[PDB]
Ligand binder design. Structure first.
Ligand SMILES: [Mg+2]
Length: 273
């Protein structure tokens, strides 16, 4: 195949992490700006690639969640106002670096801090039929009126558990496939939204643990791609990493065909035979 075992190992490593000075600087500065307005009425935490340790690009943007939750976690008002107040708190400090986006407020970085997406949100509680329990996550609204929900804590914990059980290969395989995704996008071979990082993470999550072969990145990656590809042809019922909801739920526009096509492009790019 086209890339050596060592090249796959190199691609499997995290590139940006929460240890990075520029990441710490962004979190510190943004946290101070938000606390100046909201005090203890919010919980601030990370989600996305810095939280799950799946970054494969230098100087990656960080996703900082600001959960307005005074009603649920009190000190021992609609979403439009929350997001506007969040934007104001950030603009007072970061001025022209602040840009409102559809699902977040972006705070553009500089020589000393990474860019950050600040995600104002509320507590969400929803019943999971998969687990027959009420689950707690977050909810917010996009500027184009979609209700966006997430379970970042359960996503974090389940992904960490799987990597701990697979010789650390679960997240290493996610990272490799994210690298291939960016390369295919840069080459114009796939659209930049054929698959997202979240989608890749969920696809690999559903590959059984016994497909991850200690110390064999080439064969593990082969197993991962073949398993997802075949599962997509076979109409498989994949879960999200959070194990609370189905990946191919009728709430989500992404499809098994998207995953099948992505796996094919990865297989061809990597040169497996
Ligand atoms: Mg992200």
């Amino acid at each position: 195949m086209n890339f050596s075992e060592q090249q796959l190992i190199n691609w499997s490593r995290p590139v940006s992490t929460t240890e990075d000075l520029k990441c710490q600087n962004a979190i510190t500065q943004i946290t101070a700006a938000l606390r100046a307005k909201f005090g203890n009425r919010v919980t601030i935490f990370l989600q996305g690639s810095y939280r799950n340790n799946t970054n494969v690009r230098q100087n990656s943007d960080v996703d900082i969640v600001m959960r307005y939750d005074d009603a649920f976690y009190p000190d021992l008002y609609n979403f439009d106002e929350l997001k506007a107040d969040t934007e104001e708190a950030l603009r007072n400090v970061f001025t022209t670096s602040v840009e409102r986006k559809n699902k977040c407020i972006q705070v553009n970085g500089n020589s000393n801090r990474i860019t950050a997406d600040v995600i104002p949100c509320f507590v969400l509680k929803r019943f999971s039929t998969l687990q027959s329990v009420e689950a707690e996550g977050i909810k917010f609204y996009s500027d184009d009126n979609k209700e966006i929900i997430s379970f970042p804590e359960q996503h974090y914990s389940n992904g960490t558990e799987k990597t701990n059980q697979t010789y650390r290969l679960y997240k290493r395989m996610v990272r490799i496939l994210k690298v291939v995704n960016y390369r295919l996008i840069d080459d114009g071979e796939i659209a930049d939204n054929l698959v997202s990082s979240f989608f890749i993470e969920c696809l690999v999550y559903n590959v059984p643990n016994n497909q991850f072969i200690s110390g064999n990145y080439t064969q593990t990656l082969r197993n991962v791609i073949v398993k997802i590809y075949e599962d997509m042809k076979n109409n498989a019922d994949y879960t999200e990493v959070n194990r609370l909801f189905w990946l191919f739920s009728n709430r989500s526009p992404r499809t098994r065909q998207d995953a099948l096509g992505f796996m094919q492009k990865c297989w061809n790019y990597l040169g497996y035979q």
